[PDB]
Paper text:
pfDUF512 belongs to a subset of DUF512-containing proteins that do not contain PDZ domains. pfDUF512 was crystallized under anoxic conditions in the presence of SAH, and its structure was determined to a resolution of 2.07 Å. The enzyme contains an N-terminal RS domain (residues 1–222) and a C-terminal Cbl-binding domain (residues 223–357) (topology diagram in Figure S5B). The RS domain has an antiparallel β-sheet (residues 1–14) followed by a loop (L1, residues 15–24) that connects to the TIM barrel core. Although pfDUF512’s substrate is unknown, in the current structure, L1 seems to close the active site of pfDUF512 by forming stabilizing interactions with the acetamide and DMB tail moieties of Cbl. The RS domain of pfDUF512 has a unique (βα)5 TIM barrel core, with the FeS cluster ligated by Cys39, Cys43, and Cys46. A molecule of 5′-dA is observed above the cobalt ion of cobalamin. The ligand (SAH) in the active site binds in an unusual position, neither ligated to the unique iron of the cluster, as seen in Mmp10, nor close to Cbl, as observed in csDUF512. SAH’s ribosyl and methionyl moieties have poor electron density, with very few hydrogen-bonding interactions. By contrast, there is significant electron density for the adenine portion of SAH, which binds approximately in the same position, maintaining a similar hydrogen-bonding network, as observed for Mmp10 and csDUF512. We hypothesize that the presence of 5′-dA above Cbl interferes with the SAH/SAM binding pocket and disrupts the binding of SAH.
Cobalamin (Cbl)-dependent radical S-adenosylmethionine (SAM) enzymes constitute a large subclass of radical SAM (RS) enzymes that use Cbl to catalyze various types of reactions, the most common of which are methylations. Bioinformatic analysis of Mmp10 identified DUF512 (Domain of Unknown Function 512) as a potential Cbl-binding domain in RS enzymes. X-ray crystal structures of DUF512-containing proteins from Clostridium sporogenes and Pyrococcus furiosus show unique architectural features and confirm the presence of a C-terminal Cbl-binding domain like that of Mmp10. We have uncovered the “Unknown Function” of the DUF512 protein domain, which is to bind the biological cofactor Cbl.
Residue numbers in the entry: 0 to 357
The structure:
Protein backbone atom coordinates (compact mmCIF):
# COMPACT_ATOMS: atom_id res chain seq x y z
CA UNK A 1 0.00 0.00 0.00
CA UNK A 2 2.25 2.76 -1.34
CA UNK A 3 2.41 5.29 -4.14
CA UNK A 4 4.70 6.45 -6.90
CA UNK A 5 4.67 9.66 -8.90
CA UNK A 6 3.74 9.28 -12.57
CA UNK A 7 5.28 11.07 -15.54
CA UNK A 8 2.38 13.56 -15.48
CA UNK A 9 2.83 14.29 -11.75
CA UNK A 10 -0.10 12.13 -10.57
CA UNK A 11 -0.19 9.45 -7.88
CA UNK A 12 -0.24 5.75 -8.73
CA UNK A 13 -0.75 3.05 -6.10
CA UNK A 14 1.95 0.37 -6.09
CA UNK A 15 2.79 -2.76 -4.10
CA UNK A 16 6.00 -4.10 -2.59
CA UNK A 17 6.13 -6.45 -5.61
CA UNK A 18 7.17 -3.46 -7.74
CA UNK A 19 9.95 -2.59 -5.28
CA UNK A 20 12.32 -4.75 -3.22
CA UNK A 21 9.59 -6.62 -1.31
CA UNK A 22 10.17 -4.97 2.08
CA UNK A 23 7.10 -3.84 4.03
CA UNK A 24 6.97 -0.02 4.13
CA UNK A 25 5.06 2.78 5.82
CA UNK A 26 1.72 3.41 4.13
CA UNK A 27 2.41 7.09 3.40
CA UNK A 28 5.44 6.18 1.25
CA UNK A 29 5.70 8.00 -2.10
CA UNK A 30 8.47 6.90 -4.48
CA UNK A 31 9.75 9.44 -7.01
CA UNK A 32 10.89 7.22 -9.89
CA UNK A 33 13.09 8.40 -12.77
CA UNK A 34 11.16 10.26 -15.46
CA UNK A 35 11.72 9.92 -19.21
CA UNK A 36 14.25 12.77 -18.94
CA UNK A 37 16.56 10.52 -16.87
CA UNK A 38 19.87 9.21 -18.16
CA UNK A 39 21.96 6.16 -17.28
CA UNK A 40 23.70 5.07 -14.09
CA UNK A 41 27.26 5.50 -15.41
CA UNK A 42 28.35 2.13 -13.99
CA UNK A 43 29.11 -1.34 -15.23
CA UNK A 44 28.47 -3.37 -12.09
CA UNK A 45 29.90 -6.88 -12.40
CA UNK A 46 26.64 -8.42 -11.14
CA UNK A 47 24.47 -6.20 -13.36
CA UNK A 48 21.42 -8.27 -14.23
CA UNK A 49 21.31 -6.54 -17.64
CA UNK A 50 24.60 -8.27 -18.53
CA UNK A 51 23.60 -11.86 -17.62
CA UNK A 52 20.27 -12.35 -19.41
CA UNK A 53 19.97 -15.25 -21.88
CA UNK A 54 21.30 -14.27 -25.32
CA UNK A 55 17.88 -14.34 -26.98
CA UNK A 56 15.77 -12.54 -24.39
CA UNK A 57 13.76 -9.51 -25.48
CA UNK A 58 15.41 -6.41 -24.00
CA UNK A 59 13.38 -4.75 -21.25
CA UNK A 60 14.22 -1.49 -19.43
CA UNK A 61 17.14 0.95 -19.66
CA UNK A 62 19.87 1.72 -17.09
CA UNK A 63 17.85 4.44 -15.36
CA UNK A 64 19.35 6.37 -12.41
CA UNK A 65 16.83 8.60 -10.65
CA UNK A 66 19.43 11.28 -9.92
CA UNK A 67 20.23 11.57 -13.63
CA UNK A 68 16.94 13.44 -14.13
CA UNK A 69 17.29 17.25 -13.96
CA UNK A 70 13.53 17.61 -13.25
CA UNK A 71 13.84 15.59 -10.02
CA UNK A 72 13.70 18.60 -7.68
CA UNK A 73 10.65 19.98 -9.50
CA UNK A 74 8.92 16.61 -9.14
CA UNK A 75 9.83 16.47 -5.43
CA UNK A 76 8.57 20.01 -4.86
CA UNK A 77 5.30 19.21 -6.64
CA UNK A 78 4.77 16.07 -4.57
CA UNK A 79 5.52 17.87 -1.31
CA UNK A 80 3.01 20.64 -2.04
CA UNK A 81 0.16 18.57 -3.46
CA UNK A 82 0.34 15.26 -1.55
CA UNK A 83 2.63 15.81 1.48
CA UNK A 84 3.46 12.09 1.66
CA UNK A 85 6.81 10.60 2.79
CA UNK A 86 8.98 11.15 -0.29
CA UNK A 87 11.73 8.65 -1.13
CA UNK A 88 14.20 8.60 -4.03
CA UNK A 89 15.54 5.14 -4.87
CA UNK A 90 17.14 3.40 -7.89
CA UNK A 91 20.41 5.35 -7.67
CA UNK A 92 24.07 4.51 -7.08
CA UNK A 93 25.00 8.08 -6.26
CA UNK A 94 27.76 8.09 -8.89
CA UNK A 95 26.15 10.53 -11.35
CA UNK A 96 24.87 14.08 -10.79
CA UNK A 97 25.35 13.74 -7.04
CA UNK A 98 27.48 16.06 -4.91
CA UNK A 99 27.14 18.47 -1.96
CA UNK A 100 25.21 20.97 -4.10
CA UNK A 101 22.74 18.29 -5.21
CA UNK A 102 22.23 17.16 -1.61
CA UNK A 103 21.29 20.74 -0.67
CA UNK A 104 18.90 21.15 -3.61
CA UNK A 105 17.14 17.85 -2.93
CA UNK A 106 16.79 18.73 0.76
CA UNK A 107 15.31 22.17 0.02
CA UNK A 108 12.93 20.58 -2.51
CA UNK A 109 11.43 18.43 0.25
CA UNK A 110 13.00 14.95 -0.04
CA UNK A 111 12.60 12.83 3.11
CA UNK A 112 14.52 9.66 2.31
CA UNK A 113 17.05 8.32 -0.18
CA UNK A 114 17.90 4.69 -0.94
CA UNK A 115 21.37 4.28 -2.48
CA UNK A 116 23.12 1.22 -3.92
CA UNK A 117 26.28 1.44 -1.77
CA UNK A 118 27.54 -2.19 -1.73
CA UNK A 119 30.66 -1.41 0.29
CA UNK A 120 32.41 1.39 2.13
CA UNK A 121 35.86 0.29 0.85
CA UNK A 122 36.61 2.67 -2.00
CA UNK A 123 38.93 0.44 -4.06
CA UNK A 124 36.48 -2.46 -3.84
CA UNK A 125 33.55 -0.25 -4.87
CA UNK A 126 35.57 0.99 -7.88
CA UNK A 127 36.20 -2.59 -9.07
CA UNK A 128 32.72 -3.91 -8.27
CA UNK A 129 30.98 -1.09 -10.10
CA UNK A 130 33.74 -0.64 -12.79
CA UNK A 131 33.67 3.09 -12.06
CA UNK A 132 36.91 4.78 -11.06
CA UNK A 133 35.01 7.57 -9.27
CA UNK A 134 32.85 5.25 -7.12
CA UNK A 135 34.71 6.37 -3.99
CA UNK A 136 33.16 9.86 -4.05
CA UNK A 137 29.74 8.57 -2.93
CA UNK A 138 31.35 6.96 0.14
CA UNK A 139 32.81 10.37 1.09
CA UNK A 140 29.37 11.96 0.69
CA UNK A 141 27.40 9.52 2.86
CA UNK A 142 27.88 11.40 6.20
CA UNK A 143 26.51 14.55 4.57
CA UNK A 144 23.74 12.56 2.86
CA UNK A 145 22.64 11.10 6.20
CA UNK A 146 22.54 14.57 7.82
CA UNK A 147 19.93 15.67 5.27
CA UNK A 148 17.74 12.60 4.66
CA UNK A 149 16.86 9.31 6.19
CA UNK A 150 19.35 7.16 4.32
CA UNK A 151 18.95 3.52 3.33
CA UNK A 152 22.07 1.80 2.00
CA UNK A 153 21.47 -1.18 -0.27
CA UNK A 154 24.22 -3.81 -0.35
CA UNK A 155 24.34 -6.45 -3.08
CA UNK A 156 26.41 -9.17 -1.39
CA UNK A 157 28.96 -10.47 -3.92
CA UNK A 158 31.52 -13.15 -2.94
CA UNK A 159 35.09 -11.88 -3.15
CA UNK A 160 34.03 -8.26 -2.65
CA UNK A 161 31.85 -7.59 0.38
CA UNK A 162 30.79 -10.86 2.04
CA UNK A 163 33.69 -11.62 4.40
CA UNK A 164 33.89 -8.03 5.69
CA UNK A 165 30.14 -7.32 5.82
CA UNK A 166 30.41 -6.62 9.55
CA UNK A 167 33.01 -3.90 9.01
CA UNK A 168 30.85 -2.38 6.26
CA UNK A 169 27.82 -2.19 8.56
CA UNK A 170 29.96 -0.57 11.30
CA UNK A 171 31.26 2.01 8.79
CA UNK A 172 27.71 2.83 7.67
CA UNK A 173 26.58 3.22 11.28
CA UNK A 174 29.50 5.57 12.06
CA UNK A 175 28.50 7.65 9.01
CA UNK A 176 25.00 8.01 10.54
CA UNK A 177 23.26 5.91 7.85
CA UNK A 178 19.85 4.91 9.21
CA UNK A 179 19.23 1.56 7.52
CA UNK A 180 21.09 -1.09 5.56
CA UNK A 181 19.39 -3.73 3.37
CA UNK A 182 21.35 -6.90 2.52
CA UNK A 183 20.66 -8.49 -0.90
CA UNK A 184 22.51 -11.73 -1.82
CA UNK A 185 23.60 -11.52 -5.43
CA UNK A 186 21.40 -13.19 -8.03
CA UNK A 187 23.40 -15.09 -10.63
CA UNK A 188 22.10 -16.65 -13.85
CA UNK A 189 23.86 -19.35 -15.84
CA UNK A 190 24.92 -16.55 -18.24
CA UNK A 191 27.07 -14.41 -15.95
CA UNK A 192 30.25 -13.29 -17.69
CA UNK A 193 32.31 -11.90 -14.80
CA UNK A 194 32.83 -15.04 -12.66
CA UNK A 195 30.30 -13.79 -10.11
CA UNK A 196 29.01 -16.69 -8.04
CA UNK A 197 26.10 -17.01 -5.59
CA UNK A 198 26.71 -17.02 -1.87
CA UNK A 199 26.98 -20.56 -0.62
CA UNK A 200 24.59 -21.84 2.01
CA UNK A 201 27.37 -21.28 4.58
CA UNK A 202 28.02 -17.73 3.38
CA UNK A 203 24.30 -16.88 3.57
CA UNK A 204 24.17 -18.13 7.16
CA UNK A 205 27.39 -16.30 8.05
CA UNK A 206 26.07 -12.98 6.75
CA UNK A 207 22.72 -13.60 8.46
CA UNK A 208 24.43 -14.12 11.82
CA UNK A 209 26.63 -11.04 11.39
CA UNK A 210 23.59 -8.96 10.50
CA UNK A 211 21.66 -10.14 13.57
CA UNK A 212 24.66 -9.36 15.78
CA UNK A 213 25.09 -5.84 14.37
CA UNK A 214 21.36 -5.10 14.58
CA UNK A 215 21.35 -5.69 18.38
CA UNK A 216 24.50 -3.55 18.85
CA UNK A 217 24.28 -0.58 16.48
CA UNK A 218 21.55 2.00 16.03
CA UNK A 219 21.47 1.39 12.25
CA UNK A 220 18.49 -0.77 11.20
CA UNK A 221 19.92 -3.95 9.64
CA UNK A 222 17.39 -5.45 7.25
CA UNK A 223 17.35 -9.06 6.01
CA UNK A 224 14.83 -8.68 3.15
CA UNK A 225 12.45 -11.33 1.73
CA UNK A 226 14.80 -12.50 -1.03
CA UNK A 227 17.52 -13.12 1.58
CA UNK A 228 15.18 -15.02 3.91
CA UNK A 229 13.95 -17.04 0.93
CA UNK A 230 17.53 -17.95 -0.06
CA UNK A 231 18.06 -19.08 3.56
CA UNK A 232 14.89 -21.22 3.48
CA UNK A 233 13.34 -19.03 6.18
CA UNK A 234 10.80 -16.92 4.29
CA UNK A 235 7.35 -16.56 5.80
CA UNK A 236 4.35 -14.35 5.19
CA UNK A 237 3.36 -14.71 8.85
CA UNK A 238 -0.14 -15.67 7.72
CA UNK A 239 -2.25 -18.44 9.15
CA UNK A 240 -2.63 -21.34 6.69
CA UNK A 241 -5.68 -21.15 4.42
CA UNK A 242 -8.09 -24.07 4.80
CA UNK A 243 -9.54 -23.76 1.27
CA UNK A 244 -10.31 -27.25 -0.02
CA UNK A 245 -11.11 -27.30 -3.75
CA UNK A 246 -13.49 -29.86 -5.17
CA UNK A 247 -11.70 -30.15 -8.52
CA UNK A 248 -8.04 -30.74 -9.52
CA UNK A 249 -6.26 -27.54 -8.47
CA UNK A 250 -2.57 -26.64 -8.72
CA UNK A 251 -0.63 -23.62 -7.45
CA UNK A 252 2.53 -23.12 -9.52
CA UNK A 253 5.30 -21.21 -7.75
CA UNK A 254 9.05 -20.80 -7.98
CA UNK A 255 11.73 -22.55 -5.99
CA UNK A 256 12.13 -19.75 -3.43
CA UNK A 257 8.44 -19.39 -2.45
CA UNK A 258 7.55 -23.10 -2.64
CA UNK A 259 8.04 -23.91 1.10
CA UNK A 260 5.86 -21.00 2.22
CA UNK A 261 3.17 -21.57 -0.44
CA UNK A 262 3.03 -25.27 0.45
CA UNK A 263 2.50 -24.28 4.11
CA UNK A 264 -0.14 -21.65 3.29
CA UNK A 265 -2.31 -23.99 1.19
CA UNK A 266 -2.29 -27.42 2.89
CA UNK A 267 -5.13 -28.94 0.79
CA UNK A 268 -3.90 -27.77 -2.60
CA UNK A 269 -1.09 -29.30 -4.60
CA UNK A 270 1.69 -26.71 -4.86
CA UNK A 271 4.05 -27.33 -7.79
CA UNK A 272 7.65 -26.09 -7.66
CA UNK A 273 8.77 -24.74 -11.04
CA UNK A 274 12.57 -24.75 -11.30
CA UNK A 275 13.93 -21.91 -13.46
CA UNK A 276 15.97 -23.52 -16.22
CA UNK A 277 15.59 -20.49 -18.50
CA UNK A 278 17.75 -18.38 -16.15
CA UNK A 279 19.48 -21.13 -14.14
CA UNK A 280 22.00 -20.12 -11.50
CA UNK A 281 20.32 -19.22 -8.22
CA UNK A 282 17.29 -17.58 -9.86
CA UNK A 283 14.24 -18.87 -8.03
CA UNK A 284 11.80 -16.03 -7.51
CA UNK A 285 8.27 -16.45 -8.82
CA UNK A 286 8.20 -13.22 -10.81
CA UNK A 287 10.93 -14.72 -13.02
CA UNK A 288 9.03 -17.87 -13.98
CA UNK A 289 8.86 -18.42 -17.74
CA UNK A 290 6.40 -19.94 -20.19
CA UNK A 291 8.73 -22.83 -21.02
CA UNK A 292 9.38 -23.74 -17.37
CA UNK A 293 5.65 -23.63 -16.63
CA UNK A 294 4.94 -25.81 -19.69
CA UNK A 295 7.49 -28.38 -18.52
CA UNK A 296 5.58 -28.83 -15.27
CA UNK A 297 2.20 -28.75 -17.02
CA UNK A 298 3.40 -31.66 -19.18
CA UNK A 299 3.65 -33.83 -16.05
CA UNK A 300 0.03 -33.21 -14.98
CA UNK A 301 -2.85 -35.58 -15.83
CA UNK A 302 -5.42 -34.54 -18.39
CA UNK A 303 -8.69 -33.38 -16.83
CA UNK A 304 -12.27 -32.74 -17.83
CA UNK A 305 -12.10 -29.75 -15.47
CA UNK A 306 -9.21 -28.35 -13.48
CA UNK A 307 -7.54 -25.15 -12.36
CA UNK A 308 -3.90 -24.04 -12.48
CA UNK A 309 -2.95 -20.88 -10.60
CA UNK A 310 0.07 -18.89 -11.76
CA UNK A 311 1.74 -15.87 -10.14
CA UNK A 312 0.58 -12.73 -11.97
CA UNK A 313 4.04 -11.27 -11.32
CA UNK A 314 5.58 -13.41 -14.10
CA UNK A 315 3.66 -11.45 -16.77
CA UNK A 316 4.67 -8.00 -18.06
CA UNK A 317 1.54 -6.85 -19.75
CA UNK A 318 0.58 -10.10 -21.47
CA UNK A 319 4.16 -11.26 -22.13
CA UNK A 320 6.47 -13.67 -20.33
CA UNK A 321 10.21 -13.03 -20.11
CA UNK A 322 10.94 -15.90 -22.55
CA UNK A 323 8.63 -14.56 -25.26
CA UNK A 324 5.18 -16.14 -24.72
CA UNK A 325 1.89 -14.29 -24.98
CA UNK A 326 -0.39 -14.99 -22.01
CA UNK A 327 -3.32 -16.09 -24.21
CA UNK A 328 -1.10 -18.50 -26.20
CA UNK A 329 0.25 -20.10 -23.03
CA UNK A 330 -3.27 -20.48 -21.59
CA UNK A 331 -4.83 -21.84 -24.79
CA UNK A 332 -2.08 -24.45 -25.22
CA UNK A 333 -2.70 -25.64 -21.66
CA UNK A 334 -6.48 -25.74 -22.12
CA UNK A 335 -6.30 -27.69 -25.40
CA UNK A 336 -3.54 -30.12 -24.44
CA UNK A 337 -4.45 -30.88 -20.79
CA UNK A 338 -7.90 -29.38 -20.12
CA UNK A 339 -6.95 -26.95 -17.31
CA UNK A 340 -8.20 -23.40 -16.96
CA UNK A 341 -5.36 -21.05 -15.95
CA UNK A 342 -5.96 -18.10 -13.60
CA UNK A 343 -3.48 -15.66 -12.07
CA UNK A 344 -3.26 -13.54 -8.91
CA UNK A 345 -0.67 -11.33 -7.25
CA UNK A 346 -0.75 -12.12 -3.53
CA UNK A 347 -1.36 -15.43 -1.69
CA UNK A 348 -4.39 -13.95 0.08
CA UNK A 349 -6.13 -13.61 -3.30
CA UNK A 350 -6.00 -17.36 -4.02
CA UNK A 351 -9.00 -18.53 -1.93
CA UNK A 352 -11.29 -16.06 -3.69
CA UNK A 353 -10.00 -17.14 -7.12
CA UNK A 354 -10.67 -20.79 -6.30
CA UNK A 355 -14.09 -19.97 -4.85
CA UNK A 356 -15.17 -18.24 -8.06
CA UNK A 357 -14.13 -21.07 -10.38
CA UNK A 358 -15.79 -23.53 -7.96
C1 LIG B 1 15.50 -9.96 -6.08
C2 LIG B 1 15.02 -9.80 -7.49
C3 LIG B 1 15.85 -10.16 -8.51
C4 LIG B 1 17.24 -10.82 -8.30
C5 LIG B 1 17.14 -12.35 -8.45
C6 LIG B 1 16.40 -13.05 -7.31
C7 LIG B 1 16.47 -14.56 -7.42
N1 LIG B 1 17.55 -15.13 -6.92
O1 LIG B 1 15.56 -15.20 -7.96
C8 LIG B 1 18.00 -10.18 -9.51
C9 LIG B 1 18.48 -8.77 -9.12
C10 LIG B 1 19.19 -10.99 -10.04
C11 LIG B 1 16.86 -9.99 -10.50
C12 LIG B 1 17.04 -9.99 -11.88
C13 LIG B 1 16.00 -9.79 -12.80
N2 LIG B 1 14.71 -9.44 -12.52
CO1 LIG B 1 14.05 -9.35 -10.72
N3 LIG B 1 13.23 -9.12 -9.03
C14 LIG B 1 13.64 -9.24 -7.79
C15 LIG B 1 12.60 -8.72 -6.80
C16 LIG B 1 13.05 -7.26 -6.55
C17 LIG B 1 12.34 -9.41 -5.44
C18 LIG B 1 12.09 -10.92 -5.50
C19 LIG B 1 11.78 -11.40 -4.10
O2 LIG B 1 11.77 -10.64 -3.13
N4 LIG B 1 11.51 -12.70 -3.97
C20 LIG B 1 11.08 -13.30 -2.72
C21 LIG B 1 10.04 -14.43 -3.01
C22 LIG B 1 9.52 -15.04 -1.73
O3 LIG B 1 8.95 -13.88 -3.70
P1 LIG B 1 8.18 -14.69 -4.85
O4 LIG B 1 8.90 -15.91 -5.28
O5 LIG B 1 7.82 -13.68 -5.95
O6 LIG B 1 6.76 -15.00 -4.16
C23 LIG B 1 5.73 -14.11 -3.76
C24 LIG B 1 4.71 -13.69 -4.82
O7 LIG B 1 5.13 -13.95 -6.16
C25 LIG B 1 3.49 -14.55 -4.46
N5 LIG B 1 3.42 -15.87 -5.09
C26 LIG B 1 4.42 -16.78 -5.29
N6 LIG B 1 4.04 -17.84 -5.96
C27 LIG B 1 2.69 -17.62 -6.23
C28 LIG B 1 1.77 -18.40 -6.92
C29 LIG B 1 0.46 -17.96 -7.08
C30 LIG B 1 -0.52 -18.82 -7.83
C31 LIG B 1 0.06 -16.71 -6.53
C32 LIG B 1 -1.35 -16.21 -6.70
C33 LIG B 1 0.99 -15.94 -5.83
C34 LIG B 1 2.29 -16.39 -5.69
O8 LIG B 1 3.54 -14.70 -3.06
C35 LIG B 1 4.92 -14.81 -2.66
C36 LIG B 1 5.10 -14.27 -1.26
O9 LIG B 1 5.07 -12.86 -1.23
C37 LIG B 1 11.33 -8.81 -7.67
C38 LIG B 1 10.16 -7.89 -7.28
C39 LIG B 1 9.39 -8.33 -6.06
N7 LIG B 1 9.29 -7.45 -5.08
O10 LIG B 1 8.90 -9.46 -5.99
C40 LIG B 1 11.87 -8.52 -9.08
C41 LIG B 1 11.21 -9.09 -10.42
C42 LIG B 1 10.89 -10.55 -10.15
N8 LIG B 1 12.32 -9.03 -11.38
C43 LIG B 1 11.93 -8.65 -12.56
C44 LIG B 1 12.85 -8.48 -13.70
C45 LIG B 1 12.21 -7.76 -14.86
C46 LIG B 1 14.13 -8.96 -13.69
C47 LIG B 1 15.13 -8.99 -14.85
C48 LIG B 1 14.55 -9.61 -16.14
C49 LIG B 1 15.63 -7.54 -15.11
C50 LIG B 1 16.34 -7.47 -16.46
N9 LIG B 1 15.87 -6.60 -17.35
O11 LIG B 1 17.32 -8.19 -16.69
C51 LIG B 1 16.30 -9.85 -14.28
C52 LIG B 1 16.33 -11.30 -14.80
C53 LIG B 1 17.48 -12.17 -14.26
C54 LIG B 1 18.85 -11.54 -14.40
N10 LIG B 1 19.18 -11.13 -15.61
O12 LIG B 1 19.60 -11.44 -13.43
C55 LIG B 1 10.44 -8.38 -12.64
C56 LIG B 1 9.72 -9.48 -13.44
C57 LIG B 1 8.57 -8.96 -14.31
C58 LIG B 1 8.25 -9.82 -15.52
N11 LIG B 1 8.03 -11.10 -15.28
O13 LIG B 1 8.19 -9.33 -16.65
C59 LIG B 1 10.06 -8.26 -11.12
C60 LIG B 1 8.65 -8.78 -10.83
C61 LIG B 1 10.16 -6.74 -10.77
C62 LIG B 1 8.96 -5.91 -11.27
N12 LIG B 1 8.04 -5.53 -10.39
O14 LIG B 1 8.89 -5.63 -12.47
N13 LIG B 1 15.68 -9.90 -9.88
N1 LIG C 1 22.60 -9.62 -9.93
C1 LIG C 1 22.03 -8.83 -9.02
N2 LIG C 1 21.69 -9.36 -7.83
C2 LIG C 1 21.10 -8.58 -6.91
N3 LIG C 1 20.80 -7.28 -7.00
C3 LIG C 1 21.16 -6.78 -8.18
C4 LIG C 1 21.77 -7.46 -9.23
N4 LIG C 1 22.03 -6.61 -10.29
C5 LIG C 1 21.59 -5.45 -9.87
N5 LIG C 1 21.05 -5.47 -8.61
C6 LIG C 1 20.50 -4.34 -7.86
O1 LIG C 1 19.11 -4.27 -8.12
C7 LIG C 1 18.69 -2.88 -8.10
C8 LIG C 1 18.15 -2.51 -9.47
S1 LIG C 1 17.10 -1.04 -9.31
C9 LIG C 1 17.95 0.17 -10.36
C10 LIG C 1 19.17 0.81 -9.72
C11 LIG C 1 19.82 1.93 -10.56
N6 LIG C 1 20.08 1.51 -11.95
C12 LIG C 1 21.10 2.39 -9.87
O2 LIG C 1 21.65 3.42 -10.45
O3 LIG C 1 21.55 1.84 -8.88
C13 LIG C 1 19.93 -2.08 -7.72
O4 LIG C 1 20.00 -1.97 -6.30
C14 LIG C 1 21.05 -2.97 -8.25
O5 LIG C 1 22.30 -2.69 -7.63
C1 LIG D 1 14.88 -7.52 -11.02
C2 LIG D 1 14.12 -6.22 -11.15
O1 LIG D 1 13.70 -5.79 -9.84
C3 LIG D 1 14.01 -4.42 -9.64
N1 LIG D 1 14.42 -4.25 -8.25
C4 LIG D 1 13.88 -3.41 -7.31
N2 LIG D 1 14.51 -3.42 -6.16
C5 LIG D 1 15.53 -4.34 -6.35
C6 LIG D 1 16.57 -4.80 -5.51
N3 LIG D 1 16.79 -4.35 -4.28
N4 LIG D 1 17.40 -5.74 -6.01
C7 LIG D 1 17.21 -6.17 -7.26
N5 LIG D 1 16.30 -5.79 -8.15
C8 LIG D 1 15.48 -4.87 -7.63
C9 LIG D 1 15.08 -4.05 -10.67
O2 LIG D 1 14.90 -2.69 -11.09
C10 LIG D 1 14.87 -5.06 -11.81
O3 LIG D 1 14.12 -4.48 -12.89
S1 LIG E 1 23.84 0.62 -11.26
FE1 LIG E 1 24.99 -1.28 -11.74
S2 LIG E 1 23.46 -2.95 -11.48
FE2 LIG E 1 22.27 -1.01 -11.62
S3 LIG E 1 21.77 -0.82 -13.84
FE3 LIG E 1 23.70 0.35 -13.52
S4 LIG E 1 25.34 -1.18 -14.00
FE4 LIG E 1 23.42 -2.39 -13.70
K1 LIG F 1 19.70 -1.77 15.18
Amino acid sequence: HMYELTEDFKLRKITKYELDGVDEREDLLVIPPSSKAGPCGNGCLFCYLLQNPPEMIYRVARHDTLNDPTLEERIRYARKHYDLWIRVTDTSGNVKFDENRIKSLYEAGLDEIQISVHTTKKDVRIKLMRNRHAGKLIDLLPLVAKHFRTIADIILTPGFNVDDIGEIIEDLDSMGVHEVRLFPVGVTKYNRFEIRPLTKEELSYVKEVALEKDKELGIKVVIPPIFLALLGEFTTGLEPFNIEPEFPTYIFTGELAYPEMKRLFPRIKVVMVKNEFFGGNIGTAGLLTGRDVLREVERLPEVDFGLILLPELMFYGDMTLDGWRRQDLFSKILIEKGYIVETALEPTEIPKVIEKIS
